[PDB]
Amino acid sequence: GSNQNNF
Ligand SMILES: [Zn+2]
């Protein structure tokens, strides 16, 4: 799967 971090 794909991942995204939004800090
Ligand atoms: Zn993955």
Side-chain angles (χ1 to χ4, degrees):
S2 290
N3 312 77
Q4 195 197 53
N5 297 297
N6 305 312
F7 293 97

